[PDB]
Design a binder for this molecule. Structure first.
Ligand SMILES: OC[C@H]1O[C@@H](O[C@H]2[C@H](O)[C@@H](O)[C@@H](O)O[C@@H]2CO)[C@H](O)[C@@H](O)[C@@H]1O
Ligand SMILES: OC[C@H]1O[C@@H](O[C@H]2[C@H](O)[C@@H](O)[C@H](O)O[C@@H]2CO)[C@H](O)[C@@H](O)[C@@H]1O
Ligand SMILES: OC[C@H]1O[C@@H](O[C@H]2[C@H](O)[C@@H](O)[C@H](O)O[C@@H]2CO)[C@H](O)[C@@H](O)[C@@H]1O
Ligand SMILES: [Ca+2]
Ligand SMILES: [Ca+2]
Length: 630
C-alpha cells in the first residue's frame, strides 16, 4: 500500500471527520450536511442531511478501506444508509406499492414559471405513458417497493414533523413549486403527510390541485447521489479484492440501488422523447441520462401508488463511471435481466451529452429537457436538440441558475476522468483534454501565500449545435467566469478530477499529452499542497465564506390567498409568510445574533463551514493523489 504524505493527509482528515468532538455525525451515525447548523443552500438547515452526504460517506469509507484494509467503516455507512434514507415498510407501505398500475403510472400536472401558480391542477385526462421497468423490478426483487435513497432527511427532527419529543430522523421534502422556487421560498413538508401538521389538508393542497385529499407518502430521488453510491461501492470492491475481504452483500445493495436508478432514465410522465405530447409505450420514453429526479408515492389510509421520472437533465448529475460499473463489470451486473443493457445504453448517451454541451471555452453547459416549460410546450423554431430534447442553459432551476455553480463542473468531470482512467474510452479523451485546459486556466495560484482561488460563478451564453453524433467545437456556446473564490470542497473535487485525468494520460507517448499530464498533475498536487499548508483548522480544512444571500432569511414565501396552516412548533403559515417566519427555531441558533446584526447593518454573513461532502471531497482527493502517483 502507498505510504506517502498524501496518504497521510487522507488519514489525518479521516480522523478529524470521525472524531466525536468535531460533530460530523448524529447519534444514529448519520452524517449531517455540515457541522454548523446555520446553513441554507440546497438543504435549508445544517443538520438536515442528504442522500448526497450518505453517498460521500460511502466514498470516504471506501477510500479508507483501500488505504488500511479495514472495511468496518464502509459496511457501517451502507448499514446506516439502508436503515435511515432508503424508505422502509412504514415509509412506503407495501400494500400501496403493490397496487401500482404500470399502465397508469401517475396523473399529469403542469410545472409553472412561478410559485404563485401553485397548486397545480391534476389533469386526469392528460396523456401519461407506460412504465416499462416496474414489472421487471417486481419480478426480480419479489416486492413492489423501491430501493432508492430519498434526497433529504431531518436527522434530529428539527422541524418537529416527528413530534415534540423525538430526535429520530424524519423524511422531509422542500422544493415543490417549480423553476423559480429558491431554497428560500419553500414550505417544508413531511414526506408522510398524515395531515397532522400544516393546514386542513396537511401541506398537500399547496402543491397539487384536486377535489379531495387523502393521507399519503412521497419520496424523491437525487440520481446523482445514488450513482455516487455505486461509484463508491465499486472503489470499495476494488479494495476488497486487493485485501482479500468479502463485501459481496454490500456490492449487492449498490447494484439493487443501481437497478432502481434506471427510473432516472425516463421522462416525467413517460412521454415519448422528442415527441413529448404523446404517451410512450415503454422505452420510447427513455432519455437515457441521469435526470433531475424520479419520485414515487402512494396512500397511507388506502392502497394506491404512483411513480414519475423527470423530463429535465443536467450535465452535473451524470456519472459515466457508475454507468460503466453497472454495465461492464461482472461484479456489478444488476439482477434485472435488462439492467446491464440499459446502463450500457445510458453510458454511451451520457458521454455524448457531455460532448454536446461542451462550450467553445471548455466548460460544460447546462443540459436538456423533454418538457419545455415543464408542461410539454412546443419548442421555439431553431431550438438546439439532443436526441429530441431541447437545450436548457439552466435545467430545472433559475433562482439561481442551476449551472452558475462551478461545483457541477468538478463533481461531474471527476466522474468522467475516473471513467476514462478505468475504461480508457477514447470518446472521453478530447472532452477531458478541453475541459482540463479550461479548468487549469482558471485556477489562480498565489504561490507566495500558498493559497488559490477557483471559479465560483459561471455565466452562459449561446447554444450548442444540434447533436448529429460528433462534437463540433460549439463555436456559439460560451462560458465566462464571473467570480472566483475559495470553495475548498470544490477544489478537492477538482484535484480528484485532474488526478484521474493525468493518470489516464500517463501511458500516452504523445508529446502534447505529456505536457497536459504534467500540467494537470502539478495543478492537482499544488491544490492539495496548499489546502494542507494554508487552510487547516481543528475540524478539517476550511476557510471563511461571505454569504450575501442570507439577506433572504426575510424572503417572502408565497401562500395562496385564504390558505392557513401551522408548522409543528406552532409557527403560523399564511399569506405574508417569510423563510424565517415559518422557521422561528432559527432564532434559537447560536449563530443567529451574528446573522441578525448583519441583516441589521446590511452586510453579508461570514461563516466558516465544514460541509460533510466538502471535507470528504478533500480527504478523497488526498487519497486519490496518494494512490495514483506512488
Ligand atoms: O445544489 C448543488 C450543491 O450546492 C451546494 O451548495 C453550494 C451552492 O450551490 C453554491 O451556490 C455555493 O454557495 O457553494 C455551496 C457549497 O459548494 C450544496 O452544498 C450541495 O449539497 C448541493 O448538491
Ligand atoms: O389523490 C389520489 C390520486 O393521486 C394521484 O397522485 C398524485 C398525488 O395525489 C399528489 O399528491 C402527488 O404530488 O402527485 C401524484 C401524481 O399522480 C394519483 O396519480 C391517482 O392515481 C390517485 O388516485
Ligand atoms: O423542482 C423539481 C423537483 O425538485 C426535487 O428536489 C430536488 C432538488 O431540486 C435538488 O436540489 C436536490 O439535489 O435533489 C432533490 C431531489 O431530486 C423535489 O423534491 C421535487 O418535489 C421537485 O418536483
Ligand atoms: Ca437524530
Ligand atoms: Ca424565486
Amino acid at each position: 500500500v502507498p505510504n506517502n504524505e498524501y496518504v497521510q493527509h487522507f488519514k489525518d482528515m479521516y480522523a478529524k471527520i470521525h472524531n466525536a468532538n468535531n460533530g460530523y455525525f448524529s447519534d444514529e451515525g448519520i452524517p449531517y450536511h455540515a457541522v454548523e447548523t446555520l446553513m441554507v443552500e440546497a438543504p435549508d438547515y445544517g443538520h438536515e442531511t442528504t442522500s448526497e452526504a450518505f453517498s460521500y460517506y460511502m466514498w470516504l469509507e471506501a477510500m479508507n478501506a483501500k488505504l488500511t484494509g479495514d472495511f468496518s467503516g464502509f459496511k457501517k455507512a451502507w448499514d446506516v444508509t439502508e436503515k435511515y434514507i432508503i424508505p422502509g415498510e412504514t415509509d412506503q407501505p407495501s400494500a400501496s406499492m403493490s397496487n401500482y398500475d404500470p399502465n397508469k403510472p401517475a396523473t399529469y400536472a403542469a410545472e409553472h414559471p412561478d410559485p404563485s401558480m401553485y397548486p397545480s391542477q391534476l389533469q386526469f385526462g392528460a396523456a401519461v405513458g407506460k412504465d416499462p421497468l416496474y414489472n421487471e423490478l417486481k419480478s426480480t426483487y419479489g416486492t413492489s417497493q423501491v430501493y432508492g435513497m430519498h434526497w433529504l432527511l431531518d436527522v434530529d427532527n428539527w422541524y418537529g414533523f416527528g413530534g415534540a419529543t423525538s430526535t429520530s430522523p424524519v423524511y422531509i421534502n422542500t422544493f415543490q413549486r417549480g423553476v423559480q422556487e429558491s431554497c428560500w421560498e419553500t414550505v417544508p413538508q413531511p414526506c408522510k403527510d398524515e395531515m397532522k401538521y400544516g393546514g386542513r389538508n396537511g401541506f398537500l393542497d399547496l402543491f397539487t390541485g384536486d377535489s379531495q385529499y387523502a393521507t399519503q407518502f412521497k419520496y424523491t430521488n437525487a440520481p446523482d447521489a445514488d450513482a455516487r453510491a455505486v461509484q463508491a461501492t465499486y472503489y470499495a470492491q476494488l479494495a476488497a479484492k486487493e485485501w482479500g475481504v468479502d463485501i459481496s452483500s454490500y456490492v449487492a445493495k449498490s447494484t439493487k440501488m443501481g437497478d432502481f436508478l434506471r427510473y432516472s432514465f425516463f421522462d416525467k410522465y413517460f412521454r415519448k422523447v422528442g415527441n413529448s405530447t404523446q404517451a410512450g409505450t415503454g422505452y420510447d420514453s427513455a432519455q437515457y441520462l441521469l435526470n433531475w429526479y424520479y419520485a414515487w408515492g402512494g396512500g397511507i389510509s388506502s392502497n394506491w401508488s404512483w411513480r414519475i421520472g423527470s423530463s429535465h437533465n443536467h450535465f452535473g448529475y451524470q456519472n459515466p463511471m457508475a454507468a460503466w460499473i453497472l454495465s461492464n463489470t461482472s461484479d456489478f451486473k444488476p439482477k434485472s435481466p435488462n439492467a446491464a443493457t440499459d446502463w450500457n445504453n445510458s453510458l454511451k448517451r451520457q458521454i455524448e451529452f457531455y460532448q454536446w454541451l461542451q462550450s467553445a471555452e471548455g466548460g460544460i453547459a447546462g443540459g436538456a429537457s423533454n418538457s419545455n416549460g415543464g408542461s410539454y410546450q412546443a419548442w421555439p423554431a431553431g431550438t438546439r436538440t439532443f436526441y429530441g430534447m431541447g437545450y436548457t442553459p439552466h435545467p430545472v432551476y433559475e433562482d439561481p441558475g442551476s449551472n452558475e455553480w462551478f461545483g457541477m463542473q468538478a463533481w461531474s468531470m471527476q466522474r468522467v476522468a475516473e471513467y476514462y482512467y478505468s475504461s480508457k474510452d477514447p470518446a472521453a479523451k478530447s472532452l477531458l483534454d478541453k475541459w482540463a485546459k479550461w479548468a487549469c486556466a482558471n485556477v489562480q495560484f498565489d504561490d507566495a501565500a500558498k493559497k488559490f482561488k477557483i471559479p465560483a460563478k459561471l455565466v452562459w451564453t449561446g447554444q450548442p449545435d444540434t447533436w448529429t453524433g460528433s462534437y463540433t467545437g460549439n463555436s456559439n456556446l460560451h462560458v465566462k467566469v464571473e467570480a472566483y473564490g475559495e470553495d475548498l470542497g470544490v477544489a478537492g473535487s477538482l484535484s480528484n478530477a485532474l488526478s484521474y485525468y493525468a493518470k489516464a494520460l500517463e501511458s500516452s507517448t504523445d508529446a502534447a499529452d505529456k505536457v497536459a499530464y504534467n500540467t494537470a498533475k502539478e495543478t492537482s498536487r499544488k491544490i492539495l499542497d496548499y489546502l494542507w499548508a494554508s487552510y487547516q483548522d481543528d475540524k478539517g480544512i476550511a476557510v471563511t465564506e461571505t454569504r450575501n444571500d442570507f439577506k433572504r432569511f426575510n424572503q417572502s414565501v408565497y401562500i395562496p390567498s385564504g390558505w392557513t396552516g401551522k408548522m409543528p412548533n406552532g409557527d403560523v403559515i399564511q399569506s405574508g409568510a417569510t423563510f424565517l417566519s415559518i422557521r422561528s427555531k432559527y432564532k434559537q441558533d447560536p449563530s443567529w445574533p451574528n446573522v441578525e446584526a448583519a441583516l441589521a447593518n446590511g452586510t453579508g454573513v461570514d461563516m466558516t463551514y465544514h460541509r460533510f461532502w466538502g471535507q470528504s471531497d478533500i480527504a478523497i482527493a488526498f487519497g486519490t493523489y496518494g494512490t495514483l502517483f506512488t
